[PDB]
């Protein structure tokens with residue numbers, strides 16, 4: 201299967217990337233170095249993950265060592281919710297660029313549709329625990345994203361955690377200059393996203409699947425929660441193909457024409473997770489995995505559920 205998918209900006213995006221949310225700052229530099237050494241060419245980043253400087257050390261070292269050329273890498277980051285103001289977007293992007301040791305991003309996403317009050321805190325709260333919104337709307341933030349393309353800071357722009365109506369709002373924007381290239385959403389066998397994926401794909405927007413392994417290290421995991429990696433039905437499909445469960449869970453979205461961004465800081469798993477281009481799930485395997493949908497969402501947040509633009 202081809203390693204890259206064509207975006208609606210004319211550029212090609214590697215269908216497998218390395219996730220970096222929760223990667224400790226003392227481990228992520230080696231994780232990214234190992235990833236690039238074993239073939240990864242796409243890294244998924246965000247300012248809110250608080251480790252872009254350390255990711256950037258790795259990227260810069262591999263560029264300096266001439267392991268890879270900058271043109272061969274596809275580096276993604278995301279505009280955090282407290283920077284959805286016209287006068288803050290460029291600086292937010294520039295801080296990410298500075299930390300990553302880059303002079304452009306391949307793709308910059310609106311991380312969540314909701315804007316929050318600017319300030320030091322990533323989740324500004326009122327005295328009763330509700331997030332404090334910004335009155336900025338997704339259309340004006342999109343215009344600010346378009347400026348970044350026109351200034352040369354980013355090659356593509358996109359969205360993340362946008363629901364169908366929010367994607368449609370962007371597409372219907374008066375005076376729209378650049379369509380979103382990507383919508384990055386949670387997607388795995390327990391949250392299969394058929395409806396949103398078909399909408400986005402019908403509009404030429406590429407979907408990236410986050411938390412493809414079910415984010416077992418998410419900080420709010422509970423003992424009793426469902427576990428993709430331990431699901432005996434998925435293990436059985438893996439065994440039949442002489443692959444690991446994680447490898448099946450990565451190949452699944454690839455065959456749906458999705459990009460997928462599994463996270464690891466374990467060198468052996470980084471390498472294992474990349475070994476997914478030499479086997480095929482059958483149609484029956486694919487439909488069987490789709491059948492496990494339970495609308496189980498790992499990435500959600502109670503404090504933000506009253507924001508006007510909360511997506512879920």
Ligand SMILES: NC(=O)c1ccc[n+]([C@@H]2O[C@H](COP(=O)([O-])OP(=O)(O)OC[C@H]3O[C@@H](n4cnc5c(N)ncnc54)[C@H](OP(=O)(O)O)[C@@H]3O)[C@@H](O)[C@H]2O)c1
Nearest residue numbers: 219220221410411412413414415417446462463464465466
């Ligand atoms: N746009 C957004 O709002 C958003 C939200 C969530 C995630 N994301 C992006 O998507 C990435 C991936 O999602 P995620 O981090 O939530 O979770 P994930 O990739 O579904 O799962 C990561 C977990 O799986 C473990 N793991 C990785 N490979 C494994 C393997 N081969 N066998 C067993 N366990 C394995 C990792 O352990 P070790 O690291 O200990 O090896 C880690 O605990 C994030 O890192 C981030 O880049 C974006």
Ligand SMILES: O=C(O)COc1cc(F)ccc1C(=S)NCc1ccc(Br)cc1F
Nearest residue numbers: 221246248249312313314499500501504510
């Ligand atoms: O967001 C990530 O990439 C991964 O998750 C996070 C990663 C971080 F570094 C910090 C917080 C989150 C949380 S708690 N994210 C959920 C979340 C945030 C904002 C809104 Br609007 C809704 C929502 F559900």
Ligand SMILES: [Br-]
Nearest residue numbers: 312313314510
């Ligand atoms: Br949100």
